[PDB]
Each structure stands twice: as structure tokens, then as C-alpha cells.
Design a protein around this ligand. Structure first.
Ligand SMILES: CC[C@H]1OC(=O)[C@H](C)[C@@H](O[C@H]2C[C@@](C)(OC)[C@@H](O)[C@H](C)O2)[C@H](C)[C@@H](O[C@@H]2O[C@H](C)C[C@H](N(C)C)[C@H]2O)[C@](C)(O)C[C@@H](C)C(=O)[C@H](C)[C@@H](O)[C@]1(C)O
Lengths: 174, 142, 7, 38, 209
RNA sequence: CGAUGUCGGCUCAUCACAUCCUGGGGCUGAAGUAGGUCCCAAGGGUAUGGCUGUUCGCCAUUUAAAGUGGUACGCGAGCUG
RNA sequence: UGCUGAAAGCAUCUAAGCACGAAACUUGCCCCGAGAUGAGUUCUCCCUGACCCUUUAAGGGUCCUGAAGGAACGUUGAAGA
């Protein structure tokens, strides 16, 4: 509603082509597409797409706001792209990167091999610092969630894979 | 006088082909059972099979409203130690698509030998094609 | 002999 | 967590959500106030 | 890959030079000639059909005579099929000897087990014999109780009772091959395979790897 | 009431789940080890003896564990008595 | 347990969408199984004669031929009441 009644300013190499209910976008970083819901209406007046509720359906405004939000961060990803920073707190934890397959050494007994999607690239400046660079926000967020879910943060030492400036509350060991 | 009765040698049966794509399950099944018993013909007889042969194409694409695609459970019992087997609508559509249509129609038919014969009239396929092209199946839309 | 009997 | 028939706001930061058709209470400030089934 | 059909020829033991003795079953694996090849054009599934051995020319009926003389092979006893798992192509009349089992390490042997006849519940289902003394009356190796009472009111299906024991198809899995003789067309496997001596065995490579 | 044979033991079971073990998780006044408590889960498993007619119980010694109930307090045209 | 995400400018595992997640469920292993009357498929083999009658019918009868195969019999079997 308040989200959906605000059009999205689409900048710099827009390529926002429509096919029925499908939105395809080429951009600076790449190309992202999605099939939208059937209760939403998109329109390409005034250089910038506007979202209305389609007739007949009950849930119009929430679907339209969800559509506006996903297309907004989607076209933001095709403009400049999303990044995610993970760090490894804890001794014996190294995170060397081999191309498209991250090889974590979280010290279970064996290495951890992690195949990436076709989109997100990964870089390590130091050995406790993974930086994911990808356009599609859900895929980089999902792969950061998988990499954290290999080994969670510990509430006693702070040991584990964690997000960058996310604060972990460590209870002291009684 | 006596009322008219049909005779099983002179009843003249038609062939129909029904595309079951994108339709509701039980509405289609009710129309199928009505056509199978013969209640659409004027010379209806309750002990003579009057109905027609129906070829139901595309049993894969049948639809169910609500959350029945994941939660309509089919129960059947193997007649054994304590094995009550069960399968939802999704794995029944994937594993054995024609069984959904045949179960829905067989629940709607009379029980007895006449109902089993009028169920043998029904021929359910999951593809778009059938091998019954030698009987000229007319399109029965519903 | 009261073994089968309900006594 | 606490599976209960009565879920209430124990804390200032716990919000009441309805996930998967069940009523749950999430406190982001402490995990002892997490509860279910209300 | 496919299995081969052989014959159970006794049991012996071989002595490894380390000192260990291992019991082997010797399987005479004769030349298996492929009679008919199934493919998914006509049949819907792909397979091969093999035969082995020999039969009397007067003991062969004209149906199986014509079926053998259709494609290149000679009369053996029995016909068997093998299911060709993804990537084998065999011409009819192709002799298949025991070199594929010279490569392999574990094996599955399928045979018809020895028929123990009408057996009781003690022999068939390892039931516990009741008391031999302390009062017992005509009920030493009887099966006990077979059901509860009025509430089921019936015996359950699959209740273990007496009946035919033996004489059925049994597969034994993961038997180690210890030696393959190609000039004798023999196969030594470790352990015991189902059947009497001289019974026909089916030898497939192991699936539970 | 012109008859529906009891308690216990033996033999054979079968189901429920309100789970004893195994398996999966949340919280912990959870450092680890080991627990407590709650949620999911019924595939498989789930002692031997002494005493007692005993079920039960106590006890000795194990076990991963020594589940709780229904089935005419399952089961005598199957046995015992 | 999550990711993205509004409804509800925030927040939110959820309404749209996406991913994980157990000895339970469906497969994978093994055995039975086309009486699966919805009685399936594949290959091979065997039959290539004349006439009359009547309610000229998916009809009866007569002579001549009995084919593949089967059964019977016998010797029997680590098969079997
Ligand atoms: C030789 C064979 C004899 O039977 C037995 O010895 C058995 C072993 C008795 O049990 C003997 C021994 C014993 C201990 O039961 C085993 C004892 O309790 C009874 C009273 O007598 C029987 C069966 C008794 O029945 C029982 O009578 C009970 C009153 C009720 C019971 N019913 C509820 C189920 C019923 O079956 C009873 C009365 O003798 C049956 C009547 C018909 C007879 O007299 C007949 C002629 C018998 O003598 C007999 C068949 O020749």
C-alpha cells in the first residue's frame, strides 16, 4: 500500500522488458528475471514502473508491495550489486577460496567444500574474511546463510562463522 | 400396457473423448459418472447399462481447489498384519495419475456387477494421445 | 472339582 | 522453547507472529521468551 | 554389468600362503551364448537372453528348436535374462566367459535352495519348543497360540505357521571372489551358495557396493 | 444362570503412543563430559537369576534400554494346574 | 532453522516466492506376483480336406486326417504327505 504507491526510479541501462507477467532486466552487473504474481499490475509510464492492484483478487496491496520491493532490490542488484561480508571468529578457522568452491577449514575433522551458484563470486582478503559479491539478493543471502549454517556462532567464546558487524551476545559460563 | 425397458443387444453406445486439463476433480468425475451410467439418454433403464464409452485424456493436469493438492490423503489397506498404507494427492498424481480419476469415478458409481461393467466403459489416460482412433471419439466438452 | 466352574 | 496453550508478551521486545498457522512469540533480546502453540 | 549362469560343483577350501584357509564354492561357468536381445523398440526394456550347457537333440521341442535356430546359437538347458544396465550392447551368439568376473571383487549368487519339505514351526520359524516334562500333554513342538480372542476373532494374515520349507529362490549378496580360472572355466567364491551340488546358479556382480 | 472355564507360568503374538534405547531439534541456572526439561518421531530393539503360587515387589548382576498400556485384566476345542 | 518480503515506511521463516531438515513416509536390497477378468508383452512352433441337412446360424451332422504338443506308463530324483 504505502510501499506499493511509490514508483521505482529505474536508472542507467534499464532493459526492463515485460512479457505477460514476467519481468526481465539486463544491467551493469548482469541479468535478473522473475514471474510476478497475478494480483499485481505493472506499468511503464513516465520512465519508471508503477504497481497497482489487479481487479478481482482480495490480496492486492500486499502482493503489489512485495512486487515493488523485490523488483526494487533486483534492479539495484543489476545496477551496482549486493555484497555480503562474513568473518570467522575462532582459532584454527581458515577460509581459503578455490575459484567457485569455498574450502572452509572449520576444524571438524575434514575440509568443507562449498559449491557456489553461477552468480556469486567470492574473495578472501585475509583468511578469516569471506566477501560474497552478487547481483541477486536472495541468492547471496541464501549462500551466506548456508555458509553460516555450516558452523553457527558459539554463545561462550564467540567461535563460529558470523556476519560482519552483527553482534553476538555471549553468556558467561556460569 | 407396460413401460419401456431397454434391451442389452439393441442399445447403441457412443464414444467420447474428454480433455481433463485444468478442470476440477469432482465436478468432472460427476459428469463422467452421469454419462457412464446412461442417465442422459431418454431410454434409461436401471438394470441395463445405457451409458457411453469415455476416453479421459490428460489425467495429469486435473486440478483441486484449496490445499487439497497436498492434503487429500488416499487410504487403502493391504489386508495384512496392520499395514494401512496412505498416499496424498501429490504422490498419487506423480506415481499413478489415472488412479485419481478412476477412484473418483468408482466412488460415484453403483456397486454391483452392473457398476463394474459401467466402470469398464471408462478409459483414463494421462497423456494427450490415445490409441482409440478407430472408434471415432467425438469431443464431449464440459 | 471347581476349576472350570465359575464359583 | 515453551509449548503452551497461552502465549503472552513476557518481554518488551517480543513480537507475536502467526507462522504456519500457529501463534508464536519471538523475543530478539533473549531466547528464553520464545514460545509456541498459543 | 550382467551376470553369468553356472553350476554348483561342490565345496572345498583353499589355503592362502599366509596360513589362512578359506572355504570356496566352485562354480562351473560354461560359455554363455546370447540367444535373443531385447531392446526398448519392441519390448520397452532392454535385456539379453542367454543359455548354457547342452541338451539331447531328441529332447528338444520344435518351439525351442526354432527359437535356438533363429539366431546363431545351439541348444542349452534353460534360458535366462539379464537386464543390461545402461551401456552394454551384445550381438546374438556372443560367447560370454568368466573374464568379467576376473575383474570384479564381490558377487551375488542366486539359486534355488534345498527343499526341506513340509517343516514345522520349530524348523521353519525358529519357534521355541515348550516343556518336555512338568506335566506337558501332547504339546511339545506344537505352535502354541495362533491368535488372541473375540476382538480380532480371526487369525492374522502372515501368521507364521508350518508348511513348505526350502525349494525357493534365495540370493546371497557380497561374496568375495577368490580365484577365476579361465582354462577350466571355473569360479571360486568364498562361502556357501544356495542349492544342492549340481544346481544351476546365477552369478551377478554385487549391487550393494 | 436349557454354562461366556478363573489368577500366575509357557508358547505365540498384535496394536496404540502418553518414547525406555536409538534418531532429530528448542531452551537451560548448557565451558567440555554428563545431565534437566519440552517438541517431532512407533523403523527396529526392549535382560538373566534368588525369594514368592504370585502379577507386583525387594535383591544380585548386566545392558544402548530392562517403556507404558489395549487385545474376554490377549492366548486351557494350544500346554500347565 | 533460514533467505528475500510486504500486509503494518519498521519489524517479520510467509501471505507471493526460495532453501535446508530425522531410524518415520516413497524408493533403493530381497522374495512372491498377469485369475493384474484392466487376465499384459516378446520370440518360436504347428495345422492349407471333401461333402449333405435344417430353426441358412459365431448352426448341426457324416467320412477322411490327426499336427505342434500334452497326458498316460516305466526308471527315478540332495523334488515330494
Ligand atoms: C473324561 C471325559 C469327561 O469330561 C471330563 O472329564 C472333563 C475334563 C470335565 O471336566 C471335569 C474336570 C474339571 C477340572 O474341568 C476340567 C472340573 O472343573 C469339571 C467340573 O469336571 C467336563 C469338561 C465337565 O464340564 C465342565 O463342568 C463345569 C461345571 C462347567 C464347565 N463350563 C463352565 C466350561 C464344563 O466344561 C463335565 C461336567 O464333567 C462335563 C459333563 C458333560 C460330563 O460329565 C461328561 C460326561 C464328562 O464327564 C466326560 C466328557 O466324559
Amino acid at each position: 500500500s504505502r510501499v506499493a504507491k511509490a514508483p521505482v526510479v529505474v536508472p542507467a541501462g534499464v532493459d526492463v522488458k515485460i512479457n505477460g507477467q514476467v519481468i526481465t532486466i539486463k544491467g551493469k552487473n548482469g541479468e535478473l528475471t522473475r514471474t510476478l504474481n497475478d494480483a499485481v499490475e505493472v506499468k511503464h509510464a513516465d520512465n519508471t514502473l508503477t504497481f497497482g492492484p489487479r481487479d478481482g483478487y482480495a490480496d492486492g496491496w500486499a502482493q503489489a508491495g512485495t512486487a515493488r520491493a523485490l523488483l526494487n532490490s533486483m534492479v539495484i542488484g543489476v545496477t551496482e550489486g549486493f555484497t555480503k561480508k562474513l568473518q570467522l571468529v575462532g582459532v584454527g578457522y581458515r577460509a581459503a577460496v578455490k575459484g567457485n568452491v569455498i574450502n572452509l577449514s572449520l576444524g571438524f575433522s575434514h575440509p568443507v567444500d562449498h559449491q557456489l551458484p553461477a552468480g556469486i563470486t567470492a574473495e578472501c582478503p585475509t583468511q578469516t574474511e569471506i566477501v560474497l559479491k552478487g547481483a541477486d539478493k536472495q541468492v547471496i543471502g541464501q549462500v551466506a546463510a548456508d555458509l553460516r549454517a555450516y558452523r553457527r556462532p558459539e554463545p561462550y567464546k564467540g567461535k563460529g562463522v558470523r556476519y560482519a558487524d552483527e553482534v553476538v551476545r555471549t553468556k558467561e559460563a556460569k | 400396457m407396460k413401460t419401456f425397458t431397454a434391451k442389452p443387444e439393441t442399445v447403441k453406445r457412443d464414444w467420447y473423448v474428454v480433455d481433463a486439463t485444468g478442470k476440477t476433480l469432482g465436478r468432472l468425475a460427476t459428469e463422467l459418472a452421469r454419462r457412464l451410467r446412461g442417465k442422459h439418454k431418454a431410454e434409461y433403464t436401471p438394470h441395463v447399462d445405457t451409458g457411453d464409452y469415455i476416453i479421459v485424456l490428460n489425467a495429469d493436469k486435473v486440478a483441486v481447489t484449496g490445499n487439497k493438492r497436498t492434503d487429500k490423503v488416499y487410504y487403502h489397506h493391504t489386508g495384512h498384519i496392520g499395514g494401512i498404507k496412505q498416499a496424498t494427492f501429490e504422490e498419487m498424481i506423480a506415481r499413478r495419475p489415472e488412479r485419481v480419476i478412476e477412484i473418483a469415478v468408482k466412488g460415484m458409481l453403483p456397486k454391483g456387477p452392473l457398476g463394474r461393467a459401467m466402470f469398464r466403459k471408462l478409459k483414463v489416460y494421462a497423456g494427450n494421445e490415445h490409441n482409440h482412433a478407430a472408434q471415432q471419439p467425438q469431443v464431449l466438452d464440459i | 472339582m471347581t476349576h472350570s466352574m465359575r464359583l | 522453547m515453551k509449548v503452551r496453550a497461552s502465549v503472552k508478551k513476557l518481554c518488551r521486545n517480543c513480537k507475536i507472529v502467526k507462522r504456519d498457522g500457529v501463534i508464536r512469540v519471538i523475543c530478539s533480546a533473549e531466547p528464553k521468551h520464545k514460545q509456541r502453540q498459543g | 554389468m550382467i551376470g553369468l549362469v553356472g553350476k554348483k560343483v561342490g565345496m572345498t577350501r583353499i589355503f592362502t600362503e599366509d596360513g589362512v584357509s578359506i572355504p570356496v564354492t566352485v562354480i562351473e561357468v560354461e560359455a554363455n551364448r546370447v540367444t535373443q536381445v531385447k531392446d526398448l523398440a519392441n519390448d520397452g526394456y532392454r535385456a539379453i537372453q542367454v543359455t548354457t550347457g547342452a541338451k539331447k537333440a531328441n529332447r528338444v521341442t520344435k518351439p525351442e528348436a526354432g527359437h535356438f535356430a533363429k539366431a546363431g546359437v545351439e541348444a542349452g538347458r534353460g534360458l535366462w535374462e539379464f537386464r543390461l544396465a545402461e551401456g552394454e550392447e551384445f550381438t546374438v551368439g556372443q560367447s560370454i566367459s568368466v573374464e568379467l568376473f576376473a575383474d570384479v571383487k564381490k558377487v551375488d549368487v542366486t539359486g534355488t535352495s534345498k527343499g526341506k519339505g513340509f517343516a514345522g514351526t520349530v524348523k521353519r520359524w525358529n519357534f521355541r519348543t515348550q516343556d518336555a516334562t512338568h506335566g506337558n500333554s501332547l504339546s511339545h513342538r506344537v505352535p502354541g497360540s495362533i491368535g488372541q480372542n473375540q476382538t480380532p476373532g480371526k487369525v492374522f494374515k502372515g501368521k507364521k505357521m508350518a508348511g513348505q520349507m526350502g525349494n525357493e529362490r534365495v540370493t546371497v549378496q557380497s561374496l568375495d571372489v577368490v580365484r577365476v580360472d579361465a582354462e577350466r572355466n571355473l569360479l571360486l567364491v568364498k562361502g556357501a551358495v544356495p542349492g544342492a551340488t549340481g544346481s544351476d546358479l546365477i552369478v551377478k556382480p554385487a549391487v550393494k557396493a
